[PDB]
């Protein structure tokens, strides 16, 4: 859609608006099964070599079944992403539970099984090795050799991925679940029509946010749980907040005070509140849609958005940190770049065909990506995002000029506007 | 075994007891060798397949060139230093020849290196034998397939080493098969109790092992597999869960917070306590916790007193202060800690019965008995359904003992005594 | 070369000198293309099974094309693949793939001038349209082919496409390091050789191809007009052979008997330092650099540009030209730092801190405070219940004797728990506390 961005000179921050939400709120757990076979000349020797790989893969999966679960980011909660999948896997260890799946997939490769614990799970049979080995390889004991290696390949690959990932893999590979299997799983998933179209148009993002959990191998059946994301929040407004240090620009070194907004990250409207994602690298952006997981979020009142327009508003205590580290840095935003230039650092913005077109002076400034290709801060070169969108420069006096350095708390790790004001009042009273 | 858990309302923390230790204290380094060879429509497939072998050897030669809350207090070390030491020995003249001669008659031998380390040495793939007897005279489609199967493991080993800078972890089944690993464990010069432990957790051994690409010389490809030795076994371990503890005043901006920063895994070890500040560095198998002592801090055993009496004089319990009253939850072994502040909706529900506990402002705790999920704001967390008894130790939140006008807020890494010291300095000025 | 190291007892820090720089400063973007074909008995089942893998890989690549893209907290925020994504955005323009398609008609290697002006080297590393249209089209248009060699030849020919699709699928279309399937050694060396760079840069990249792979990105881009194109982003080393040094720091605390009365001080400016264009490139997280013997490969994106006077903090932490960065606390836990030619040991409380030889046992027992031991005769360092191995690399260590600067401060007014402070900031806070008295 229409992505916009506003830079606030007063607080050295920028907000990118125009995004749509796709927040993970639930999990769909499906049981993927592979039917195995009960096993007690140069060409035939190749079959036994390939058959030993099958026997080793089963043994490795048995050993694998034993060892298996069966800025403000430090404020996040502690949870287990695969807990719902582990619950389905625990049920499969009950007596007769695997037989239910085995009987449901006797005539077809796709059925809905109601487990004993009550969970109704869609179950696939993606590879039938019992059918192949018992009917094609059992009576014998070059086309058979080649056909066997291709058919047996998927079991070997699934075993390798599970082995080097403690039985839990993410993203879900095409060997764990092919595109046709995943798309058909999405189509028959008991979800909204908006969710079906969303997941179908973003199959890769679904893979990256899914888990494959090695579960059980019993009664000639290998079963693993594929945990797919359910996006219960769709098409609500999201915005990304970029922050950078804001310092005074006094010439004499060591007399400068700094202030940095610590509330950077992704913000999305969610159920009357705002889901705040402090580590923006945990979200995946597709054009104008941002895919996040609510497990990596903090639930904040919607008034937190007021800190972008008025950092001194009384309705929300805007979070900042203070220091005297006036080092130069840059933040590449969605439609531009924030440049915090201090000291003797060379800060420029250049175009690919013409060289330097803007020289940044001391302080915090901003340039849009229109006509700009790269930004240099010191000895480092940064490439700006070339995505289309309008940027708006909101002129304002840097709020750091409002503070007296003699009483400014110049080392607050995780403070706020009111917290700094309270400390100033205590220091001024002593004077 | 018997997993128990105690929640301390006074300090907003919980301890899960009943675990047994398995701490990595040493390394066993083994030298894994693959013997290499110095080098029609159907033969065109062989020459294409032979180039894959030739490129993998060339790639390994280029690879040989490139030689191999309180977590910020951890020490700086190299996990593969012991394996690299063995790899440095293999570059000496005649050192590879000893391994080459020791594996002439068998695929498994114990070689004493020049530096003194006695290492078990495997020959897992013999390509010189295959190439010299079947492919040398030729330069039958069955031979082509036989070559691809024999050469497959070398391509995979080269592939894994290439995208991992020559050091891979966990050790894949291509670096070391289960039979090779089990036989390596069986002939390892360790106790029979340690052999059974490593054999019953071979995958965990893989996850805590390293494969170090080493040398390719004199028709021999050698890489070092570094297996963990668990020198601390079956000592008591406990996990400490912490969550922010804040006052619950209605008027915004007048609240102070306090959080115990000493969360993580704790295990008894040689008269002291090994403290693992980042609990994600340990692997739990039922009631046994596998950690690496390299990710631990050695603390006096009196650190345990912080759970029963945070104001005890024997240990200065570590805390951090702030005014960030955001709501959060911690899923423990047998329950969940919920820090609910402001206007946040914090509840605990059953899937068939709905909400059974509504958390009020402050720090509280719910056991997993009858509870399936915990909701804090817009986030849903699932509790552990494992069986075990929880004990709720009623207590006045210690944050109520402090005067907010002199309370040192925004202390990044402080302690009980350190906060008291700043309060006395602030009170004296008044 | 000659690696040396100096330990400063006064500040509980060590500097390792003698390294040479190889800093990533720019990106070279090349377009790697694979020409694909438009496609409408026991063996025919094998060919169609292998043909379905080709068709499934193309579909997966299409879905993949749809979804297209101590002081480290002070580092700048950027996108490492922005330059490659910018080139990939150009390839979505009409007729842009056709230009590449026509430019690689006669050769497998050509320089294409894009519409926006960027000149990119373009490779054709695999021609599947040539194989399928000439060998597989007549067979399927009739069936029942009788020599099995064609089936094996097809799967081997199709193998590289399957692997590239697999790596791109489980990595969101961006892979790093660049595998040999994305770009073979022969392809990479020829790409390096024809890269319009200095001969010094060519020799450096050729002798360290693995580091080039590890510092490169492969970005899946577009699949259109029977052409699969992905962008490989290779590192440009614009800073070469300048002096580098690594600064190791450890907490420096007092050793008072009464518990809880001790103050601590730690230099926070640890990391890699390299001379660069009159300033110093400072890499606070040293784990982001790769060391090859005595050459250090870093990426400037993980660096801060500091004035060269920052080096004065190693010889005189109280110098007036640069405000040396420190942090203060009262956390007297024991820890160790393994340096290039030794080990720093901060031993506090009742912890057992020793340095031992495997054949000779303990040769140094550390007392309370911060000390240092060289790797001469030392194999391991033990702090508490943890064992660390020292580097056995040859080199001279110099012990710069000095009284620990923490003894210069009065604990009653010492500003404890300063998360990110400095020498001057601590002095300023002390002066305000002393004025109140
Ligand atoms: C302050 O000093 C007194 C003794 O003078 C001591 O009892 C107290 O614990 C100290 N701390 C506080 C917070 O009062």
């Amino acid at each position: 859609q229409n992505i916009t961005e506003e830079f606030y000179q007063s607080t050295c921050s920028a907000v990118s608006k125009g995004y749509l939400s796709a927040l993970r709120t639930g999990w769909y757990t499906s049981v993927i099964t592979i039917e195995l076979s009960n096993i007690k000349d140069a060409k035939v020797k190749l079959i036994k070599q390939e058959l030993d790989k099958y026997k080793n893969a089963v043994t490795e999966l048995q050993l694998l079944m034993q060892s298996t679960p069966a800025f403000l980011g430090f404020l996040l909660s502690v949870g287990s992403a695969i807990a719902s999948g582990v619950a389905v896997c625990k049920v499969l260890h009950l007596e007769g539970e695997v037989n239910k799946i085995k009987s449901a997939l006797l005539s077809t490769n796709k059925a809905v099984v109601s487990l004993s614990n009550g969970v109704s799970v869609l179950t696939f049979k993606v590879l039938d090795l019992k059918n192949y080995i018992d009917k094609q390889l059992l009576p014998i004991l070059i086309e058979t050799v080649i056909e066997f290696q291709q058919k047996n390949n998927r079991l070997l690959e699934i075993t390798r991925e599970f082995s080097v990932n403690a039985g839990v893999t993410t993203p879900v590979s095409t060997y764990m679940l092919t595109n046709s299997e995943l798309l058909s799983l999405i189509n028959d998933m008991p979800i909204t029509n908006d969710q079906k179209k969303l997941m179908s148009n973003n199959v890769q993002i679904v893979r990256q946010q899914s888990y494959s959990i090695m579960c059980i191998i019993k009664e000639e059946v290998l079963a693993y749980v594929v945990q797919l994301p359910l996006y219960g929040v769709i098409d609500t407004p999201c915005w990304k907040l970029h922050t950078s240090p804001l310092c005074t620009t006094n010439t004499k070194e060591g007399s400068n005070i700094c202030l940095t907004r610590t509330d950077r990250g992704w913000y999305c409207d969610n159920a009357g509140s705002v889901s705040f994602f402090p580590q923006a690298e945990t979200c995946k952006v597709q054009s104008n849609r941002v895919f996040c997981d609510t497990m990596n979020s903090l639930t904040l009142p919607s008034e937190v958005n007021l800190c972008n327009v008025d950092i001194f508003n009384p309705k929300y205590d805007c979070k900042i940190m203070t220091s005297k580290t006036d080092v130069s840095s840059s933040v590449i935003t969605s439609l531009g770049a924030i440049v915090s230039c201090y000291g003797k650092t060379k800060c420029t913005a250049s175009n690919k065909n013409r060289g330097i077109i803007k020289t940044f002076s001391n302080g915090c400034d901003y340039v849009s990506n229109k006509g700009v290709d790269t930004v240099s801060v010191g000895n480092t070169l940064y490439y700006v995002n070339k995505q289309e969108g309008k940027s708006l420069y909101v002129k304002g006096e840097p709020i750091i000029n409002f503070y007296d350095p003699l009483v400014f708390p110049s080392d607050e790790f995780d403070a706020s506007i009111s917290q700094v004001n309270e400390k100033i009042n205590q220091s001024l009273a002593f004077i």
Side-chain angles (χ1 to χ4, degrees), chain A:
Chain A
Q1 286 180 358
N2 183 37
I3 301 292
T4 61
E5 180 168 306
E6 300 180 358
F7 171 77
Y8 305 104
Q9 184 187 14
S10 55
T11 59
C12 189
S13 53
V15 178
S16 304
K17 303 184 183 180
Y19 297 87
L20 298 174
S21 61
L23 307 184
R24 202 280 297 167
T25 66
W27 292 108
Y28 188 73
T29 59
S30 63
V31 178
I32 306 303
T33 67
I34 296 181
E35 190 174 11
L36 301 174
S37 169
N38 220 346
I39 300 178
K40 302 182 300 180
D41 186 7
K43 182 182 300 181
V44 174
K45 191 176 186 292
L46 295 188
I47 291 180
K48 281 184 173 297
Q49 286 178 359
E50 194 60 36
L51 197 63
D52 286 340
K53 293 182 180 189
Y54 168 86
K55 188 186 293 183
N56 288 337
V58 169
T59 296
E60 165 67 18
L61 287 174
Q62 291 175 337
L63 293 177
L64 208 46
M65 169 182 55
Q66 286 181 354
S67 79
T68 189
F71 181 92
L72 301 177
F74 62 98
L75 301 175
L76 288 186
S77 307
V78 179
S80 185
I82 62 171
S84 54
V86 169
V88 172
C89 183
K90 189 189 187 171
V91 182
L92 298 186
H93 281 71
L94 300 181
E95 304 294 331
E97 201 66 25
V98 185
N99 199 23
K100 297 174 66 180
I101 292 178
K102 192 178 188 59
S103 178
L105 295 180
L106 185 60
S107 298
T108 179
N109 302 321
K110 187 260 190 59
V112 193
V113 183
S114 60
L115 302 182
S116 60
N117 73 333
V119 185
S120 180
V121 289
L122 192 44
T123 307
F124 279 94
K125 183 162 59 184
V126 300
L127 187 59
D128 200 335
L129 285 181
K130 176 173 165 311
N131 184 16
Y132 179 82
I133 293 177
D134 290 2
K135 295 186 178 179
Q136 293 279 335
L137 269 47
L138 177 61
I140 297 180
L141 295 178
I142 193 62
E143 291 76 26
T144 307
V145 180
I146 304 303
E147 185 189 24
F148 182 41
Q149 298 176 158
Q150 299 289 345
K151 205 127 180 323
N152 196 30
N153 186 17
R154 185 170 176 182
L155 175 63
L156 294 191
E157 182 64 22
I158 291 181
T159 305
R160 205 212 71 242
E161 304 184 359
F162 273 153
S163 295
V164 293
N165 291 123
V168 180
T169 68
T170 173
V172 171
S173 67
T174 47
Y175 296 86
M176 297 285 174
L177 212 56
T178 73
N179 288 321
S180 182
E181 293 162 359
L182 181 55
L183 284 172
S184 64
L185 183 51
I186 292 175
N187 195 351
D188 289 291
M189 203 165 302
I191 56 182
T192 323
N193 297 290
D194 296 329
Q195 279 173 334
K196 289 184 185 185
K197 188 176 180 174
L198 173 68
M199 297 177 75
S200 297
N201 295 327
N202 302 273
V203 177
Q204 274 308 119
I205 304 295
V206 174
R207 286 189 181 279
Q208 299 167 25
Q209 300 190 340
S210 303
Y211 293 87
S212 185
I213 305 160
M214 171 56 194
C215 186
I216 200 181
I217 168 169
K218 179 169 75 61
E219 300 180 345
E220 305 175 347
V221 170
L222 158 69
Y224 55 94
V225 177
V226 171
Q227 202 177 276
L228 298 185
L230 290 185
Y231 300 105
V233 181
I234 295 178
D235 290 336
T236 66
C238 293
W239 59 99
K240 188 176 181 188
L241 176 54
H242 318 266
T243 71
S244 200
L246 174 70
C247 308
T248 57
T249 57
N250 295 333
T251 50
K252 53 181 295 176
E253 196 69 11
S255 72
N256 288 291
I257 54 180
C258 297
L259 172 154
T260 310
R261 294 183 64 190
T262 52
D263 52 358
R264 57 182 153 192
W266 273 105
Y267 288 79
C268 294
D269 289 326
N270 190 349
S273 304
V274 170
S275 290
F276 163 56
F277 305 84
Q279 310 298 146
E281 56 276 18
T282 63
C283 296
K284 269 77 72 176
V285 177
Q286 288 295 154
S287 66
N288 72 311
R289 178 171 304 273
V290 47
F291 292 83
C292 302
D293 190 343
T294 55
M295 195 165 296
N296 305 320
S297 68
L298 295 174
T299 306
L300 303 181
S302 59
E303 286 79 4
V304 66
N305 192 26
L306 294 178
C307 292
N308 302 319
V309 185
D310 185 14
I311 200 170
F312 297 107
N313 73 311
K315 295 187 174 172
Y316 191 87
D317 191 15
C318 305
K319 305 197 66 60
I320 60 172
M321 72 165 269
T322 71
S323 73
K324 295 180 63 181
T325 307
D326 51 340
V327 294
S328 294
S329 68
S330 180
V331 179
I332 301 297
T333 71
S334 306
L335 300 173
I338 304 177
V339 175
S340 297
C341 204
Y342 304 109
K344 303 184 173 321
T345 309
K346 178 179 170 78
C347 310
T348 55
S350 296
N351 189 326
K352 62 174 76 67
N353 298 322
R354 283 173 285 279
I356 294 174
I357 62 178
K358 183 181 180 55
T359 300
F360 297 97
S361 56
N362 277 341
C364 180
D365 204 356
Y366 172 88
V367 66
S368 72
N369 60 344
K370 178 183 170 55
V372 178
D373 288 319
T374 59
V375 162
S376 288
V377 174
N379 297 330
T380 314
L381 179 78
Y382 306 100
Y383 288 77
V384 308
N385 278 315
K386 295 310 287 175
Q387 175 172 47
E388 196 76 19
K390 306 179 175 179
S391 295
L392 179 58
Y393 195 106
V394 185
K395 294 203 200 72
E397 174 179 18
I399 65 169
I400 194 61
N401 300 342
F402 298 153
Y403 293 97
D404 180 19
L406 301 187
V407 298
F408 184 76
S410 57
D411 199 350
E412 301 286 304
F413 153 73
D414 173 27
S416 63
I417 291 298
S418 293
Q419 185 162 358
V420 167
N421 287 343
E422 200 183 347
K423 289 197 66 65
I424 291 180
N425 275 342
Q426 293 173 3
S427 303
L428 282 174
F430 292 161
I431 281 167

